[PDB]
Structure formats: C-alpha cells, structure tokens
Amino acid sequence: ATLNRKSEREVFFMNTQSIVQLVQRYRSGIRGHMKAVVMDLLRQYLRVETQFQNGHYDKCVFALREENKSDMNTVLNYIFSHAQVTKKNLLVTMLIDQLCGRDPTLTDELLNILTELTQLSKTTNAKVALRARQVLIASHLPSYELRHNQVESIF
Amino acid sequence: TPGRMQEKGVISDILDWKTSRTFFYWRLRRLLLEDLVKKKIHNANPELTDGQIQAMLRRWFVEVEGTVKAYVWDNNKDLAEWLEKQLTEEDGVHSVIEENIKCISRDYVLKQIRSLVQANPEVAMDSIIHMTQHISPTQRAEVIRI
Amino acid sequence: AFQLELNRMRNFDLTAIPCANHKMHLYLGAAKVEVGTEVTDYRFFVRAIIRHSEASFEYLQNEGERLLLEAMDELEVAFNNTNVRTDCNHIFLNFVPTVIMDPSKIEESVRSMVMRYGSRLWKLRVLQAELKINIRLTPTGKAIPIRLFLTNESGYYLDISLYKEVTAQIMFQAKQGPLHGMLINTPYVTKDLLQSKRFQAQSLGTTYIYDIPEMFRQSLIKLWESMSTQAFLPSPPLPSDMLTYTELVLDDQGQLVHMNRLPGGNEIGMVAWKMTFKSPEYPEGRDIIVIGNDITYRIGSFGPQEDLLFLRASELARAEGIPRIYVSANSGARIGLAEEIRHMFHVAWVDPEDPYKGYRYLYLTPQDYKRVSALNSVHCEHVEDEGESRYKITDIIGKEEGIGPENLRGSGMIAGESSLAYNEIITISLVTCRAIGIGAYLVRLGQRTIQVENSHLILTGAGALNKVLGREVYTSNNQLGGIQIMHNNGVTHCTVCDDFEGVFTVLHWLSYMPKSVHSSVPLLNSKDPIDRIIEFVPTKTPYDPRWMLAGRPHPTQKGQWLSGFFDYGSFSEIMQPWAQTVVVGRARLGGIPVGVVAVETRTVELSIPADPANLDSEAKIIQQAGQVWFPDSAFKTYQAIKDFNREGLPLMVFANWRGFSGGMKDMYDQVLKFGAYIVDGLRECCQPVLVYIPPQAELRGGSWVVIDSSINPRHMEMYADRESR
Amino acid sequence: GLPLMVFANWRGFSGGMKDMYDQVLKFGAYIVDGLRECCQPVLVYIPPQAELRGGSWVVIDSSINPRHMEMYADRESRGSVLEPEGTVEIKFRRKDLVKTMRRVDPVYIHLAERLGTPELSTAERKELENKLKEREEFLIPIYHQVAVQFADLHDTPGRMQEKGVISDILDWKTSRTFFYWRLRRLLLEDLVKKKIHNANPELTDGQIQAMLRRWFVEVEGTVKAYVWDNNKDLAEWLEKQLTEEDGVHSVIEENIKCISRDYVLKQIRSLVQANPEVAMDSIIHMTQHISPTQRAEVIRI
C-alpha cells in the first residue's frame, strides 16, 4: 500500500509473485490442492478427450485440424494422448479411486464436473461414466472400509 | 508548470483536451466498478483496510489475467471489460474469486468463534450438542476415533 | 325484477330510451343535483338481464358478441342523435343462468372481451361495467353469484374485482381486491366532489392531488419521446404496460396496508402510493414511494394521522432504501383550539361593565364544567369569586386529537426520521403553490427543490413582517421565497413555469439516479459517441464555460454546433443564477451521469437587491471577479458536492482558480470556514471524484491545498492539462 | 463526549427578504443533522418568561433521539409550532371576534338581546345595528390582546406532559440541584447500558432499558418497585453493584455474563446455519482442552 505510488517494485514483483502463488494454493487447506490439482487435471483429460470425440477419429481429426488448421502439435499431443487411453484410463481409475475413496461429501464445482463427466462417449472411457454414478451414490451410502467399520459396529 | 507538478507526484498525468472525453469516460466507468467490487470485499471481511483492498484487487487481477498483463491495469478499456466479465454469472457458473471471497469470509467467521471460545472455553459442551445437530454420525465417529 | 339491481344508480335522473331486445333495458342518466348547481354528468346507462337457458360459454359468448354490436349500435345512434360528452357510461349484465367454471380464466376472458373492441370503446368512451354470473362446483350444485365488476378510469387501464357473494348483511367476498367487502345496494357516488376539489385546486393554481399520478404518466410520455433524442432507447412500452401503483393506507393501528381503493377516499390531508415503472434509464423497472400533501384537506396542514402516514410509509421506504418524493404545498402543522372550550369558556373581567379594566382569568360555570371536566379536556381549579363558583382553566388538554403538542411529537419524530433519511436515502421535494414553515424546512431537508413560478418557499409571510414593521414593506411572499429568491440564492435547484413541467423536470433529474441505495447508477447507451473531438476550444480570453462543457453554435456554418466536452444536450444546470462566477449541474459523459462543476473566468457583475425593510438598503450591484473563490461559490460548491455525493454520483471539477478571495469583506464572510467544510464533504465522499485543470487555467495556493488527494485518496484523482499552471 | 445543558429560547428564524435570501434556512437544517448524531444526554430547559416556537422547536424536539434528549420547562415558559399572533390571525377572524363579544361582553350581549326581538320599530332596528357596530369596533383592540394570550394558553406543559413529550416542570431556584442528580443518573444508566450494549450489540435500546429495570425490581423484590422512581436513590444503588468489588453484589455481573454466553451461542448457531461446513472443525480446535468428563459426554451421545 505504501510501496505502491512509485512503481519501484521489480524486486517486489518477484517477491509479490513468488509469495502470491504459494499463498494462493494454501487458503483452503491441504484440501486446497487435493481439490484443485486433481480437479483441474480431471478437466484437463476430460476436456481434451471430449473435444476429441464427436463422431469418429478421422472426421474428428479433420474438425480438430480445421479449428486450428495452421498447427497440429498441441493437437498431436492430444492425438498421441488418446492413442494410449487404456494406459490413461487405468490411471484415471487410480485418481478417482483414491479420491472418491477418500472424499465423500464434497461440493458443487465437483458434482458439476461429474455431471459433465457422465456424458462421456467411448469404449475405453466407459468405466469412468459408471464410476461417475456409482461414486455419486456410494457417496450417499457406501460400503468401503470406513463404513465397514460402521457395519462391524452394527453387527 | 505541469511537467514539474507531475514529476513531483501530486497529480498522476498530463492530458490533452481533445482526447479527454474518451479517456475520462473509460477510466471513470472502471473506477466505479472497482468501488462496487471493493464494497463486496469489505462486506466479505471487515478487517481489511481500503488500501489493502486496493492492492488485493490488483493482485487478483494479476493472478487471473497473468503477470504478463500487469501493465494492462493502466489501460482504461481492458480492465473495465475484465471487471464486467465477472458479475455477469449470478446463480450459475461461479467465478473462482467468488469462491475465494466466501473462503476468506469462512476463515474470518471461524476466527471469530475461535476468539470467542478463547474468552469462554467452558461453554463448548453445551454449544457442541447443538453443533452436532448437522453432520453428526461422522462427527461422532471422528471425535471417538481421536 | 328487483334482481336487476336498479337502486345502485338511484343517485341519478334517468330517461327511458326504447330499444329492441327488451331484456336489454337502456336508460340515459343525468346526475341529479340540487338547485344550487346545474348538472355536469350525463352518463349512458344500459342494464340487461339474460335468461337464455363449456357449452354455456360458447353459447353465452355468441349472445355477448351480438349484444355488443347491437348495443353499441344503439349507443351510437344516441351519440349521433345527441352528444353531451358522456363520461362514466354504465353497463350492467345479469347472467341469471348458473354455469360452472374457475375465476382467473374468466378474468382473461373479460380482458379479451373488453379488449377486442378498442377504439370503439373509446369513441363511445365507456368507463363502467358490472356483471354477474352464478357458479358453484360440480358436486355442490349450490349456485352462488360472483359479481365481477370492471374498473377503468381515464386510460384503458383496468382493474377487475372478482368476488363470491357471502353473508347477516350480504357482503362481496372473494388476493387483494378493491371493496374486499361492502353490501350490494350502494347508491351511486356523485363525481361532483371530484370536480369540486379540482376546482379548488385549479383556483389555487395547482393540480388535484389524485390526478398527479396521471400527471406523472403524461410527463413520462414527454420524457420517453424527448430522451430518445439524447439516448438510444427501446420501443416505448404500451401505456397499459408502463405503470403500476398501489395506494398505501393506515389500519386502525397506524400500520401500513396495501390498498386498491377509489381515489378521494382519504380521511386525512396526506396521500401515498408505491409506484413501479419501466423508464429509459430503468427499462426493467424502478420503484419509488410518493408522499404528498392534500391541500384540499385544510390547506394541507399536518395532523398526527398525516404525520403518521408520512412517517410509516417513509419508514418502509427506508427499510428498502429506495427514493422518497415529497410534494409540498402547505401551511404547516395542524393548528387548533379546543372548540368544546371555545364555545363555553368565560372571561373574568376586572369589571364587566367596563372590560378595558382588564380580566383576571378564564373559567366555566360549574354546570358546564362538571361534564367536559371528566373527559381529559382541561385541568381546572375551583374558585369562589363574587359569590359564584367558577372553574379556572389551568391547562387545556382537548378532546380533539391532532391540534396539540402531539403534533410536535409526531413532527419531531419525522424530523429525526427524515434527517436520518437524507443521510440514508434519496430525498426529493417539489414546490407547487406555497410552502410555509415546517413544510419549507422539510423541503430543504429534502435537499432538492424544483419550484414552479408563483410558488414560494418561506417560513413567514411578507404580510406578517409588514405588520411587525407597521407598514407594507413587502408585496409578495414570492419576494421572500419565490424562485427569484431561492433560485437566486441556490436554495432551489430548478425553476418551472407550471406543474406539469415541474414533474417532467423531476423525472429528468431522476433519469440519472440509482433505483435504491443498495443499487447501481442507471447506465445509458448514449447517442453522443466517445471518440469524437470537442470542437469548442477554451481560450485565455474569458468565455461562457458552458460553451466548453455543452458546446456552442458554430460562428460560420450555421446551424452547426461547436461541441462541448459533454454529451450534446445532457447538461442540465441547477442553481444557475446564484454566484454565477461558478456553474454547477449534472450531465452525462458517454451516457454515464456525473455531476459537474466548473468556474466562469470573466468577472461577474452581481446584483444584490435592496432590503426594503431597511431604509438604507438600496439594490447594490457588485463586481465579482472571475477565477476567484468567494463565499457563495464555495457554499454552492459544497452543497453540490455533498448532495451529489448523497445521490451516489461521481463528481467532476473543471478547475481554473487564480486564488481565494482574500479581501476584508470576503474574509469577514468566512471563506476559510467553507474551506474547512469542503474537506469535510470530500471526507464523506464515497465515489470517484475527478478534477481536471483545463488548458490556460491555473491553480494556486489555497485552491489546491484544500482539495489535495490525501483527504480521501481512496476515491479522488486529479489531472492537469499541459496548458495549465 | 459531554452532556449538554441548553437553556433553549428561540422564537423562530428572522424572515425578511435580504436575510432569507441570505440562507438562514440552510444552517438551521444543518444543526438538526448535528444533534441527531449526539450520543449523550442533552438536558434542555426553557427558562421562565421565555418561549420557543416553530422552527426552533421543530429542529430540537427530544423525539429525534429520545435515548439522549430530555426537555424541561419552567412554569412560566411557552412553546409551539406557531406563536400566538399567527394562531389568532388564523383562528381569530371577524366571526370569532363578534361571536366572542356576543358570548361574553354584558353590554354587547344586551344589545344582541334587543336585536333579537320580532316586530321592532325600524328606528330601534337601525339603531340597534348601529349600536352593534359601534360597541364592537370601539371594543375590538383589547379582545385581540386577550386572544393572543388565549392562543398562547393552548401551548402549555400540562398537556405536553400528559401527552408524554416532556418529562418535568422545574422551579429555577432548586432546578440546579435537581438537574445535577437527574443528569448524574442519566449518565450512570447510560454508562451501564453502554456496557450491556457492548456485551450484545443487536439488542435494542428499549428492551435493554427493560432488562435493567427488571433485574432491579426482581432482585430487590416486587415489593420494592416504587423505589425505582427516585433518581438519587437508584444512583446510589447502581454504583454499589458496580463499585463494590468481590461482594454479593456481582449479581447483575453474573446475569450479564449469562446473556453474553447466550448471545455468543446464538452467534454460533447463526454462523453454522449460514456456514454449516464449519461445525466439525470448530469443535476440534474448541475441544482441544475441555474436561475428560466432558469427553465422556461426547462419547455417550
């Protein structure tokens, strides 16, 4: 506030940035990252491969081609990416499994991505959709190992 | 003269009359927007001084729009468009910063209670029974767990 | 035959006109009046009955359409044959069968019905319709009547009142509905009251109180047309879709009740409504609360009920933060003496056979005292004097509510409330006929005053003061408070030639203002583009600064216009003739309203009128240098800054000051004090304040220092042109 | 932060052309804003033979800030919206002048008695009408004087008090002593309520008043209610509770403490309602120290 009026702040620039991105991750706790990183990465994968499929690989690649006709390298990393979906897909399971296993009572931004996520239209990403629903309810009533403690109790 | 005046800092710039209308128009509309948002921020957390708020808003801009674009703040037109493109989505897709504002607000309310309990820790139990009236089965388990 | 309810128009003199379809009986009605006056109303009445035996509605409909063309043919012959500007024509339809259906599609049906014929209605200028139709539900089979009554006044705006007919004296009972219940045999109200009060108002140079809303509508129309020049506007709305009002009314407990009642029903000298309408600046709609004196009720004095209406409506207004419009034309607080005592008090003369030897006290004989005494009317003491027993009046308490110090409590109450209100909400005041005393104070407290010619804004009348001085010093209260005083001293912001133009002007200022205090300023898409150049160029030579601001006519290629700084036609000055070395007002810059103050550079020669009271006083004429801050300039500046700030507007100052006036007189006149206050004002400023030093201007010493950005750095910015100093 | 003692005495604003043009109204309004923001007692006293009228009254009635304003009038003071001459001028026209003589003056009454006979000689008739104009017109001045007094007499304190706009009539000689004790308690009561309001700001001033009065009569007994109306005596009472440390007097202190706990509890309830997500985490920090027995209660539920 008192450093402001001069514009003598390029030392300050690399300290007000070096500090603001660290502090910006950390407001909502350890679940600031546990939300944020996986959620963004999820949309990263999701978005990529949702733009990826709207019909069939060839025609879709021509529509991709033509949205960014001049270059295809970002696209190629995309194309290259869905070549190994099954690799990707297992790891997708990994991500969801230990999130969805850890999580259960979360929030609108996520449930929003999930309802976005259910529309997913491909043979490899056929688990992920069923995962969307089974998770969304098993939220409401699970049988994982914590409520396995609860049923142990009931018994 | 104005050269000296500006150099010494009691005014921010020397203008030319002919382009004064457009200039002042764009700046004022965004000056006004800034006031409106800061009002929202102050409501979100009374402890911040207006000054700290100023810096904070700039920081949120630099955060959202990028370190590369700091200079844009001094471009009347571009920040105005940026400010407007936030208040458009109500009861729909929410902005990250809106989430942040509730979070700071959340943090502050929590601290208020923290201070309150600090003055009066003995009150907890009776407060707690009511506190448990929500989330309760999980909450019982974690307390018992610990 | 009684069932044709023919007594509800017995307040008439009606002539039987013969007609076919004798079911349908039409009478021509002449308002029955007393010998003192000659009749003014001449309404066409047609009252029918229909005993014609989903099926019913189509069947009914066909008979209705036929009846409408034939009926309007008959009334057409009546117009053609003789015309006397009929006004409140009545249609009565008695459906004596009993169909089964719901009420709100019935309500759409009666709109579609009355609507299908449009101009035809207006040519015949039909104003009143009553129907019945018996319904019940499919199991019950108990046909009940549901008297639907149509309500349309000037304008095609129609309020439909639908009920159920329920008992022991039968009662129209269904929402909110006008006449939530009254019995059925209501003899017909005579208009001549309305006309009578309108006559008193026009004869008082004003508008009848309940006609103002419609005065609003006409001004609004003029605005809708005029402002499209200035701004890009939507297609105007239909008059029918343009406005909704709801009367606000006191229950027994002085609690607000939303009421759709007939105009003229007020039992006190104060009226209020809430109105919401869509305007160029607020096309999605905006609301206000309007309070107004009714000068017809005791020249609009303020009793407790009036105070209470004002208060509680205002209180609600404050609750939501939206503006309060107060129409002031009055004689201040209600006054009275205990009439009950006036007519029975006695004077205890020193000598009755010679009164000029003085009197000792006032009193009541014991008989007269023993009954009023019981009623919290007076405080007395018994006395023996000259044999008789008398009751010395010590305090007069008074059975009449509203003529006592309670009026002060209520008044003070609203003083505090209103005082806070100015600091809390938007206040506006309109000066129509005369404001005396408390009305004036309230008007100033209202902080914004439009004043029609021949109105005046005064506390005490020229006559009263002339009497105090033993001669006719003054000739007109306007001398004290007319626009020639208040516009000339900056108390009044705008002046107008008549009531209509007053109202138009009100809305015109308002076209710049935020819907509520919680609400943002209304933004326009203006027709003056932003990337234009200003053609008029300020000069070292002095000039009317309105040319710099608003532009001027082009000297050569007329009728061109040297454009000013602001949007063509947007600057609407206020308080222009007081301290004319400076000019203050409101405008729009690219369609954003700001308030704006700039300073005249040529010396003003100011004329000061003579105080006729003071025999020394001659009308002085004073040179007031340009580019100088005087007391007046500073005060006008202070009020404008504060007031505009209280609207929530940004401020723009076009600074060009050589200095503060430092002479004996102006210093005596306290220029320093207002220098302190300007700062106070800015300290309370809450929105952007932009200062621009124009080319060839200068800013020196006192003038900069008292407006440095430090006082409210949060909100202020200052820029100077290269050609400034 | 001072109390104010105003010996209030203004008949109105001066209304001639020049000074009115010169804007006295503006500064009159401004005073109103100023007093409205006042936060401590203002005891206003209109002295004997004074009067305070219309605008000056309007802008200073205690109603604006009943919490802090109080008004007192000497028996010989007077006050109104409008001074007697302007009241009379409106409410003492010809009709009232003739009527009032017709009601009160014996000579005049008699004359009227003669004018009231049928079958009078036109001599006596014309003569009587003349007698009426002459008696009335010669007589007119005094009754106007009476009228203005008469009008002024409508504006008195008895009605004011009964109507609740004034608190008391004083007598100047001992008014000082009175005002001392009176003011002193205004200060003390105010002092305690500031402490309470600090304890719980949402509570309105009125109910807060009630709380103090109620705790006093309740504690000291319903039998002792009447004691409350003595300014001096309560002053002594309030101070001892406050002033006497570590006694059996920290009753009110405990009671206020109870409200503080309750209001705090309510705040927490409201916070969770707006922010239910906070519950779980709020306890953990809160529970970090509490009794082991209390730990047991969490386990039972």
SS (H, E, C) D59-100: CCCHHHCCCCEEEEEECCCEEECCCHHHHHHHHCCHHHHHHH
D286 touches chain B (CB under 8 A): yes
B115 touches chain D (CB under 8 A): no
Whole-angstrom Cα distance, residue D155 to residue B15? 65
Q: How many residues are given for chain D? A: 301
Quick count: other Cβ atoms within 10 Å of Cβ D253? 12
Between the two ends of chain C, the Cα-to-Cα distance in Å is: 93
**Which of B48, B71, B103 has the alpha carbon at shortest distance from A24?**
B103
Six-digit token string for D227: 């004691």
Mutate to test the interface with C, among B6, B19, B20 (most CBs of C within 10 A): B20
Give the number of beta-carbon pairs within 8 Å between B and D. Answer: 82
Whole-angstrom Cα distance, residue C419 to residue D63? 12
Using the 8-state DSSP alphabet, how is residue A144 labeled?
S
Collapsing DSSP states into helix, strand and coil, what is residue C717? strand
Whole-angstrom Cα distance, residue B60 to residue A24? 10
Using the 8-state DSSP alphabet, how is residue C605 labeled?
E
Q: Catalogue the E-assigned strands of C412-482.
A: 427-436, 449-452, 457-458
Cα of B51 to nearest chain A Cα, Å: 6
Q: Which residues of C are annotated as a binding site for CoA?
A: 434
Chain A residues inside the 8 Å CB shell of B11? none
Cα of C516 to nearest chain B Cα, Å: 14
Residue D203 · residue D196 · CB < 8 Å: yes
Strands C388-396 and C449-452: what pairing? Answer: unpaired
Whole-angstrom Cα distance, residue D228 to residue D124? 72
Cα of B17 to nearest chain A Cα, Å: 25
Single-letter residue type at C222: K
> Count of alpha carbons within 13 Å of C467, Cβ hemisphere only?
8
D267 touches chain B (CB under 8 A): yes
D78 is in an annotated binding site: no
B6 touches chain A (CB under 8 A): no
Six-digit token string for B94: 């929410």
Whole-angstrom Cα distance, residue D110 to residue C116? 76
Region for A112 from its dihedrals, namely left if φ exceeds 0, alpha if ψ lies in -120 to 50, beta otherwise: alpha
C429's enclosing H/E stretch is: strand C427-436
Collapsing DSSP states into helix, strand and coil, what is residue C298? helix
> Measured between CB atoms, which of B11, B31, B54 is closest to C720?
B11
Cα of C74 to nearest chain D Cα, Å: 56
Chain C: partners with 3+ C-beta pairs within 8 Å? B, D
**Which of C273, C271, C226 has the alpha carbon at shortest distance from C245?**
C273
Contacts of D51 (CB under 8 A, 6+ apart): D9, D11, D77, D78, D79, D80, D83, D152
C559 cis-preceded (ω within 30 degrees of 0):
yes
Ranges of H-type helices in D153-230: 157-162, 172-199, 205-220
D295's enclosing H/E stretch is: helix D292-300
Whole-angstrom Cα distance, residue C699 to residue C710? 17
Residue C431 · residue C452 · CB < 8 Å: yes
Using the 8-state DSSP alphabet, how is residue C4 labeled?
S
The packing angle between helices A30-52 and A57-67, to 10°, is: 110
Residue D82 · residue D198 · CB < 8 Å: no
Using the 8-state DSSP alphabet, how is residue C244 labeled?
E
The packing angle between helices D122-152 and D84-91, to 10°, is: 150
Six-digit token string for C378: 């007076």
Whole-angstrom Cα distance, residue C585 to residue C718? 20
Question: What is the dihedral sign for C-alpha C686, C692, C697, C698?
Answer: positive
Cα of B88 to nearest chain C Cα, Å: 14
From residue C189, alpha-carbon distances to C9, C34, C41, C543, D6 in Å are 9, 15, 12, 63, 56
Gaps in chain B following residue numbers (C to N > 2.5 A): none
Cα of A13 to nearest chain B Cα, Å: 9
B24 touches chain C (CB under 8 A): yes
Residue C445 · residue D29 · CB < 8 Å: yes
C residues 361-420 closer than 8 Å to D (CB):
362, 376, 379, 393-398, 404-409, 411-413, 415-416, 419-420
D93 is in an annotated binding site: yes
Quick count: other Cβ atoms within 10 Å of Cβ C82? 10
Contact B100 A17 (CB under 8 A): no
D87 touches chain C (CB under 8 A): yes
**Which of B35, D214, D212 has the alpha carbon at shortest distance from C686?**
B35
Chain D residues inside the 8 Å CB shell of B132? 279, 283, 301
Contacts of B87 (CB under 8 A, 6+ apart): none
Quick count: other Cβ atoms within 10 Å of Cβ C115? 12
Whole-angstrom Cα distance, residue B28 to residue C716? 11
Chain C residues inside the 8 Å CB shell of D160? 405
C100's enclosing H/E stretch is: none
Collapsing DSSP states into helix, strand and coil, what is residue B1? coil
In sequence order, what are the beta bridge partners of C43? C29
Six-digit token string for C85: 């500007």
Residue C608 · residue C648 · CB < 8 Å: no
D280 touches chain B (CB under 8 A): yes
**Which of C347, C349, C344 has the alpha carbon at shortest distance from C373?**
C344
Buried-exposed string A106-123: b where 16+ CB fall within 10 A, e elsewhere: eeeebeeebeebeebeee
Mutate to test the interface with D, among B43, B123, B135 (most CBs of D within 10 A): B123
Tell me the backbone φ, ψ of residue D69, rounded to 5 degrees: -100, 145
Give the number of beta-carbon pairs within 8 Å between C and D. Answer: 176
C273's enclosing H/E stretch is: strand C270-277
**Which of C543, C453, C539, C433 has the alpha carbon at shortest distance from C495?**
C453
* Chain D residue with Cα closest to C395: D158
Mutate to test the interface with C, among B24, B36, B48 (most CBs of C within 10 A): B24
Residue C625 · residue C606 · CB < 8 Å: no
Maximum pairwise Cα distance, chain B:
76
Cα of A143 to nearest chain B Cα, Å: 14
Residue D268 · residue B127 · CB < 8 Å: yes
Whole-angstrom Cα distance, residue B8 to residue B128? 60
Contact B54 A1 (CB under 8 A): yes
B121 touches chain C (CB under 8 A): no
Whole-angstrom Cα distance, residue D77 to residue D248? 48
Pseudo-torsion of CA C411, C415, C417, C418, nearest 10°? 120
Collapsing DSSP states into helix, strand and coil, what is residue C14? strand
Chain D: partners with 3+ C-beta pairs within 8 Å? B, C
Six-digit token string for B59: 């920081």
Chain C residues inside the 8 Å CB shell of D164? 409
* Chain A residue with Cα closest to B103: A28
Contacts 24+ apart (CB under 8 A), D111-120: D111/D135
Residue C291 · residue C312 · CB < 8 Å: no
Contact C438 D139 (CB under 8 A): no
> Count of alpha carbons within 13 Å of C607, Cβ hemisphere only?
6
Pseudo-torsion of CA B101, B104, B106, B112, nearest 10°? -140
D residues 128-187 closer than 8 Å to C (CB):
139, 142-143, 146, 150-151, 153-160, 162-165
Chain B: partners with 3+ C-beta pairs within 8 Å? A, C, D
